[PDB]
RNA sequence: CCCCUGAAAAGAUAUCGGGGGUGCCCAAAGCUCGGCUCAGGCGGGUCAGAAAUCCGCCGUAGAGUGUAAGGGCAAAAGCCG
RNA sequence: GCCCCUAACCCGGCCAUAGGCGCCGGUGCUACACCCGGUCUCAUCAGAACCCGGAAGUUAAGGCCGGCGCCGCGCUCGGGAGUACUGGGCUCCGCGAGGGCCCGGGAAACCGGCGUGCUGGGAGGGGGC
């Protein structure tokens, strides 16, 4: 900036995306990382192995991949986070990954957040990620009951606000109240594909 | 004050950092730029005389001041201060030391001889290289004889040999 | 080994509005001020309202005795009498430490200075005796009499 | 005339102006029971919980140490801020100095006593207090300087200006700017 | 007075950093998985000085003998004596000369 | 015993050589987690002032880090919980 | 499932050719954002932030790309300059401190010129197997 004595920080640090103090602790594990990132519309999950010249990504997917299994809910709701976790979990096992460590970046590790929702789906697929027992969201929020109860109470109170707060839910063909029913639908088709794939 | 031959030769490292030196003497040179120092006035002058050193050595602060008065007084009354600019170019940063048995000068000065022989501050001097410019005179070409005479007078008060160089700006 | 104490702090026993004399009041005014105030202590302030010292009855009497003493040879202002230096204790000061300071300094009083460094009140022997009256222990006078 | 509808909408829908937040300050020296009175006063005045603002540094001339609570403050948001702002602006008299505006869409003014405030009455067990009223105006897109990830500086064109601020109070708040 | 011998007793210039190298250092040196038999350069990192080797081993080349938890056991020489340095990879570099 | 310099860009290196310090202190000034950013300056703001609490802008560390000197340290090694 | 090419996005490496000030633009189906609310998980004085649910609007800002000027910066470029300094030899000069010569190395400031992120893996998009 000003003068030669100025020290410009790291590019990722000055852009504001990498906490290098936390990254050094993650690199000390010598195990693959499960990068979980959150956007305004989508959720990113990756299994990343760090290398000296740059991280090597094994499996990296966004929430757009759920459309392959006919997901009909919000792209970055809690249920969408868990479904996104299974695919990266299953594809990670097909690439030989048995274990990983969670990397939530600059996100807070609040209990029940979607970043632990993604990690839950990874655990169910068969990839061990060590974690705290009291941060993973409940099954009711995983299957979207909190979304269904919000629409059901809001429909009976303000139906006009129903068509605006869930305007895109209807046009997909799925009212938000059948999201818990639709969740078990999608979860079998992700599960049965990757299990039956694993048979061969 | 000892003869200047005791302090002429450069025999060790410079001793200038005054935060570590106890009782370092103050510089007793009142002015370094004589005459008309303003840049608007010095554009009138067109000649430059330099009293250049010939040998590397140390010039004591009292020798620098003594050369400064005799040269500046001569140009004052032979040339007029409005007709020249005279600058003493060097500053006596080096602190001279002396090892003598004295009055209350620290507890370790009471031990005679070469025991605890690190001296106390005894003055200041300028350490100069060959070709270093000691005195810098800006002047007009009509007063060339007077400026050489003033510079020659200043040379007589200095411990090392010096030569006058005259060139235009 | 005297043990049981009030628990009372200095601010309880304070006298806030000490009667005041300005620095250029002569000594006749000093006696008249002592008479009107009915107090054993006065605080002196300057033209700017700045307290510089406290004049006690004993200091005034001793000054009169020393200065005006000659009868075999028969033939000022208030600032000269005040003492700027006094024992001092802050607001949380206890009666034991205050009495110790008053005894050690040999004063009739003790000037309380705040955290900022300014006087707010003075406590003398009489308020100490009164604080004993509201709280003081049980002793026969034979162990306090001179 | 609620918070969503005191907008100063510009020619861009993203250039609208509003009240980001209004805060009230009480600087009382050290009094713990005094500060408790001060906290109770704001808790009833604003309808929101106060915040004990500890001393940043110790100054013996003020008799204060760092680490002790010597102030009460509260940050008001959408609906609560406007109602007190209208309530506060009555006590000020619908009058704010033009020099009171800063060059960053900000303005603070102080109410000397809260008995001038509407819905207020004299109380002898709490006394009479004065406040600082700090109201901040912003445009949409100010979150870029405050989000945790990918923090950045808002552009020059997307910051509330001192000109755009004063026009907000006259036309939207109806406050006399002299 | 004779020289004092602290663990870092003439390390002013060694442990100083230029203004352009101020702050945290890059993490690429953590990502070199050294095996037994490879050659490494001991390059002390001043920001992790608690785990750094002595100044006498700066600039020297050793042989990785093994790993102890997370440190690397390095065999080197000081003149004629065989020394065993156990340091983390942040004070190491790979040797590309042989 | 410890730091800088002497010390001559590996290592080592003396003098009654130069500038200094040590014989402690701390249940938090130790451990970890999280949040924040310091000195200072500026603009606005009742008391309020050079300096208190409040709103915003700038601010390469010009602060702090128990204690000598040197080194290190900014989503920290500092401050707060 | 595979090889090839390729913006804005995710994870990096080196950590200013990458920074700072100002100016002129491009980008919007998708992606990134701003954005809309606070039932639920979660949080504070404050749903500002964090966390959660969402999709009316907007490219105004952030992001990414292109161009110009200034400061800062970089260069195994030209001058400075074979200069300053330096390893070895000397019955070579000087009263002396010091300097010279032969053999072998060789800067820095500064001036001018040029440059102003490069690059690894993945997602998305296109092609073919
Ligand atoms: Mg010598
Ligand atoms: Mg020894
Ligand atoms: Mg230790
Ligand atoms: Mg050495
Ligand atoms: Mg910390």
| Per-residue three-class SS string for chain E | CCCCCCCCCCCHHHHCCCHHHCCCCCHHHHHCCCCCCCEEEECCCHHHHHHCCCHHHCCCEEEEEEEECCEEEEEEEECCEEEEEEECHHHEEECCCC
CA to C1' distance (Å), from A13 to G61: 21
List the resolution, Å: 2.5
What's chain D's Rg over C-alpha atoms? 18
Phi-psi domain of B159 (left: phi exceeds 0; alpha: psi -120 through 50; beta: other): alpha
Identify residues of D whose CB sits under 8 angstroms from chain A CBs.
Answer: 148-152
CA triplet A129, A132, A137: central angle to 5 degrees?
A: 90
C-alpha of A66 from chain center: 11
Q: Answer whether D111's CB lies under 8 Å from D117's CB.
A: yes
How many helices and strands (H and E) does chain D possess? Answer: 3, 7
Q: Answer whether B57's CB lies under 8 Å from B158's CB.
A: no
In Å, how far is E1's CA from the nearest CA of chain A? 37
The Cα A26–Cα A103 span in angstroms is 8
**What tokens does A86 get?**
């299974």
Q: Answer whether C81's CB lies under 8 Å from D25's CB.
A: no
Beta-carbon count within 10 A of A131 CB: 16
Nucleotide nearest to A5 (CA to C1'): F60
Q: Which residues contact B3 (CB under 8 A, 6 or more apart)?
A: none
D149, HSE (Cβ side, Cα atoms, 13 Å)? 11
Q: Answer whether C126's CB lies under 8 Å from C7's CB.
A: no
Burial class, A180, CB count within 10 angstroms (exposed 0-12 / middle 13-18 / buried 19+): buried
Q: Answer whether B90's CB lies under 8 Å from B44's CB.
A: no
C-alpha dihedral over B15, B19, B22, B24, to 10 degrees?
A: 60
As beta bridge partners, residue D59 has D64
**What tokens does A73 get?**
């809910």
Q: Answer whether D51's CB lies under 8 Å from D72's CB.
A: yes
Bridge-based pairing of strands B57-60 and A101-103 is: unpaired
Q: Answer whether E8's CB lies under 8 Å from E32's CB.
A: no
Beta-carbon count within 10 A of E59 CB: 10
* Straight-line distance from the first to the last Cα atom of chain E, in angstroms, rounded to the nearest whole number: 43
A12, closest residue in chain E (CA to CA): E26
CA triplet B88, B94, B96: central angle to 5 degrees?
A: 120
The Cα D104–Cα E32 span in angstroms is 50
- Packing angle of the helix pair A179-199, A78-94 (nearest 10 deg): 0
Bridge-based pairing of strands E71-78 and E61-68 is: antiparallel
Q: Answer whether A113's CB lies under 8 Å from A76's CB.
A: no
Q: Answer whether B153's CB lies under 8 Å from B70's CB.
A: yes
What's chain A's Rg over C-alpha atoms? 19
Chains A, D: CB contacts within 8 A come to 13
- DSSP at B156: T
Q: Answer whether A65's CB lies under 8 Å from A56's CB.
A: no
Q: Answer whether C54's CB lies under 8 Å from C111's CB.
A: yes
- DSSP at A66: G
Bridge-based pairing of strands D95-96 and D131-138 is: unpaired
The Cα-based distances of C120 to C23, C85, C113, D64, E55 in angstroms read 19, 15, 7, 18, 63
Burial class, B139, CB count within 10 angstroms (exposed 0-12 / middle 13-18 / buried 19+): buried
Does at least one atom of strand G sit less than 7 Å from the CB of D97?
no
Beta-carbon count within 10 A of B138 CB: 22
Strands (E), chain A: 33-38, 43-49, 56-62, 101-103
**What tokens does C88 get?**
């001092």
Experimental method: cryo-EM
Query: Are chains C and D touching, using the cut-off of 8 Å on CB pairs and a minimum of 3 such pairs?
Result: yes
Residue D40 CA to ligand 5 centre (angstroms): 35
Q: Answer whether E72's CB lies under 8 Å from E42's CB.
A: no
CA to C1' distance (Å), from B128 to G98: 14
Which positions in strand G are less than 7 Å from the protein's CB atoms?
A: 9-16, 18-20, 22-23, 30-37, 39-43, 45-58, 60-64, 71-74, 96-98, 117-124
Q: Which residues contact B106 (CB under 8 A, 6 or more apart)?
A: B22, B120
Beta-carbon count within 10 A of A12 CB: 12
Residue B74 host element (H or E): helix B61-78
The Cα B123–Cα B15 span in angstroms is 11
For residue A101, which phi and psi values (nearest 5 degrees)?
-125, 135
Residue A75 CA to ligand 2 centre (angstroms): 73
C-alpha dihedral sign at E43, E48, E52, E56: positive
**What tokens does B123 get?**
């003055």
**What tokens does E48 get?**
């992790």
Residues of C in contact with D62 (CB under 8 A): 116
Q: Answer whether A146's CB lies under 8 Å from A110's CB.
A: no
C-alpha dihedral over C128, C129, C131, C137, to 10 degrees?
A: 120
- The answer to whether the CB atoms of A24 and E31 lie below 8 A apart is no
C-alpha dihedral sign at E80, E81, E82, E87: negative
Beta-carbon count within 10 A of A32 CB: 25
Q: Answer whether D11's CB lies under 8 Å from D23's CB.
A: no
Buried/exposed A78-113: b ≥16 CB within 10 Å, e otherwise: bbbbbbbbbbbbbbbbeeebeebebbbbbeeeeebb
Question: Which among B71, B74, B81 has a CA at the least distance from the CA of B136?
Answer: B71
C-alpha dihedral sign at A90, A94, A95, A100: positive
Q: Answer whether B64's CB lies under 8 Å from B126's CB.
A: yes
**Collapsing DSSP states into helix, strand and coil, what is residue A68?**
helix
Write down the H helix ranges in chain C.
Answer: 27-37, 57-67, 95-105, 125-135
In Å, how far is D150's CA from the nearest CA of chain A? 4
The Cα C49–Cα B61 span in angstroms is 57
* Straight-line distance from the first to the last Cα atom of chain D, in angstroms, rounded to the nearest whole number: 24
Q: Answer whether A18's CB lies under 8 Å from A26's CB.
A: no
The Cα C128–Cα C136 span in angstroms is 10
**What tokens does C50 get?**
């700045």
Q: Answer whether A111's CB lies under 8 Å from A135's CB.
A: yes
- DSSP at B24: P
Sheet holding A43-49, edge to edge: A56-62, A43-49, A33-38, A101-103
Counted residue by residue, chain D has a size of 178
Q: Answer whether A186's CB lies under 8 Å from A63's CB.
A: no
**Collapsing DSSP states into helix, strand and coil, what is residue B57?**
strand
Q: Which residue has the tokens 């009555």?
A: D90
Residues 39-98 of E with CB under 7 A from strand G: none
The Cα-based distances of E81 to E75, E84, E92 in angstroms read 11, 10, 21
Question: Which among E10, E93, E91 has a CA at the least distance from the CA of E52?
Answer: E91
As beta bridge partners, residue E39 has E63
In Å, the largest CA–CA distance within chain C is 59
C-alpha dihedral sign at C112, C118, C120, C126: positive
Q: Answer whether B137's CB lies under 8 Å from B36's CB.
A: no
Residues 21-60 of B with CB under 7 A from strand G: 55-57
Q: Answer whether A143's CB lies under 8 Å from A113's CB.
A: no
C-alpha dihedral over E16, E20, E25, E28, to 10 degrees?
A: -120
Query: Are chains A and B touching, using the cut-off of 8 Å on CB pairs and a minimum of 3 such pairs?
Result: no
- The answer to whether the CB atoms of D61 and C114 lie below 8 A apart is no
Residue B121 host element (H or E): strand B120-128
The Cα-based distances of C25 to B163, C22, C119 in angstroms read 80, 6, 21
What's chain C's Rg over C-alpha atoms? 17
Q: Answer whether C108's CB lies under 8 Å from C56's CB.
A: yes
Q: Does A168 lie at the interface with E, CB-CB under 8 angstroms?
A: no
Q: Which residues contact B149 (CB under 8 A, 6 or more apart)?
A: B74, B78
For residue C64, which phi and psi values (nearest 5 degrees)?
-65, -40
CA to C1' distance (Å), from B16 to F61: 30
Q: Which residues contact A92 (CB under 8 A, 6 or more apart)?
A: A47, A58, A59, A100, A122, A125, A127
The Cα A101–Cα A99 span in angstroms is 7
The Cα C53–Cα B42 span in angstroms is 66
């Amino acid at each position: 900036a000003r003068g030669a004595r100025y020290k410009v920080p790291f590019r990722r640090r000055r852009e504001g995306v990498t906490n290098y103090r936390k990254r050094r602790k993650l690199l000390l594990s010598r195990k693959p990382r499960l990068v979980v990132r959150k956007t305004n519309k989508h959720l990113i999950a990756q299994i990343v192995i760090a290398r000296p010249h740059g991280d090597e990504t094994v499996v990296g997917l966004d929430t757009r991949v759920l459309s392959k299994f006919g997901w009909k809910g919000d792209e970055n709701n809690t249920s969408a986070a868990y479904l996104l976790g299974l695919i990266v979990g299953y594809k990670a096992r097909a690439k030989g990954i048995k274990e990983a460590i969670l990397d939530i970046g600059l996100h807070r590790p609040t209990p029940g957040a979607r970043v632990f929702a993604v990690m839950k789906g990874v655990i169910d697929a068969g990839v061990e990620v060590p974690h705290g027992e009291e941060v993973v969201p409940s099954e009711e929020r995983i299957r979207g009951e909190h979304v269904a109860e919000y629409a059901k109470r809001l429909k009976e109170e303000a139906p006009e606000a129903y068509k605006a707060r869930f305007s895109r839910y209807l046009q997909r063909g799925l009212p938000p109240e059948e999201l818990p029913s639709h969740f078990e639908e999608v979860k079998k088709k992700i599960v049965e594909y990757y299990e039956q794939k694993l048979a061969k | 004050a000892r003869p200047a031959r005791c302090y002429r030769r450069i025999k060790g490292p410079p001793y200038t950092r005054e935060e570590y030196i106890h009782g370092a003497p103050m510089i007793q040179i009142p002015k370094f730029d004589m005459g008309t120092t303003s840049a608007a006035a010095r554009a009138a002058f067109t000649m430059v005389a330099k009293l250049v050193a010939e040998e590397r050595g140390q010039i004591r602060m009292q020798a620098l001041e003594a050369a400064r008065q005799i040269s500046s007084k001569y140009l004052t009354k032979y040339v007029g201060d409005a007709n020249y600019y005279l600058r003493l170019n060097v500053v006596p940063h080096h602190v001279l030391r002396e090892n003598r048995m004295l009055a209350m000068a620290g507890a370790d000065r009471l031990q005679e001889g070469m025991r605890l022989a690190f001296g106390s501050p005894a003055g200041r001097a300028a350490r100069v290289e060959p070709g270093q410019v000691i005195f810098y005179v800006e002047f007009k070409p009509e007063h060339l004889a007077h400026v050489k005479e003033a510079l020659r007078r200043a040379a007589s008060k200095l411990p090392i040999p010096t030569r006058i160089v005259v060139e235009p700006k | 080994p005297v043990k049981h104490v009030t628990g009372l702090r200095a601010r309880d026993v304070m006298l806030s509005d000490v009667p005041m004399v300005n620095v250029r009041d002569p000594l006749s005014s000093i006696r008249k001020a002592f008479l009107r105030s009915k107090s054993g202590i006065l605080a002196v302030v300057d033209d700017s309202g700045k307290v510089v010292g406290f004049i006690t009855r004993r200091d005034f009497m001793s000054y009169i005795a020393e200065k005006s003493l000659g009868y075999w040879r028969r033939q000022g202002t208030a600032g000269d009498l005040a003492k700027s230096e006094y024992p001092t204790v802050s607001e949380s000061a206890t009666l034991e430490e205050v009495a110790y300071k008053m005894l050690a300094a040999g004063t009739d009083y003790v000037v309380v200075i705040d955290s900022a460094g300014q006087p707010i009140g003075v406590v003398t022997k009489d308020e100490l005796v009164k604080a004993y009256k509201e709280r003081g222990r049980s002793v026969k006078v034979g162990e306090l009499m001179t | 005339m609620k918070w969503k509808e005191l907008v100063l909408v510009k020619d861009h829908p993203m250039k609208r102006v509003y009240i980001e937040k209004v805060v009230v300050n009480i600087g009382v020296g050290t009094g713990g029971e005094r500060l408790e009175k001060a906290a109770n006063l704001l808790r009833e005045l604003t309808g929101a919980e106060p915040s004990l603002r500890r001393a940043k540094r110790s100054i013996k001339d003020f008799g204060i140490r760092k680490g002790e609570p010597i102030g009460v403050a509260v940050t008001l948001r959408r609906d609560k801020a406007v109602e007190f702002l209208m309530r506060a602006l009555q006590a000020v008299g619908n009058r704010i100095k033009r020099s009171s505006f800063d060059e960053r869409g900000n303005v603070c003014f102080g109410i000397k006593e809260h008995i001038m405030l509407p819905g207020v009455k004299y109380d002898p067990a709490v006394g009479i207090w004065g406040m600082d009223v700090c109201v901040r105006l912003a445009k949409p897109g100010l979150r870029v300087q405050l989000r945790r990830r990918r923090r950045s500086k808002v552009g020059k064109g997307q910051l509330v200006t001192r000109e755009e601020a004063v026009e907000f109070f006259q036309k939207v708040l109806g406050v006399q700017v002299d | 007075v004779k020289r004092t011998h602290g663990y870092r007793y003439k390390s002013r210039k060694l442990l100083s950093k230029a203004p352009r190298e101020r702050g945290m250092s890059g993490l690429s040196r953590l990502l070199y998985e050294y095996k037994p038999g490879d050659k490494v350069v001991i390059d002390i990192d001043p920001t992790f000085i608690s785990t750094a080797p002595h100044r006498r081993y700066q600039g020297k080349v050793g042989v990785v003998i093994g790993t102890r938890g997370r440190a690397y056991v390095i065999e080197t020489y000081i003149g004629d004596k065989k020394k065993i340095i156990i340091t983390t990879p942040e004070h190491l570099r790979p040797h590309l000369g042989g």
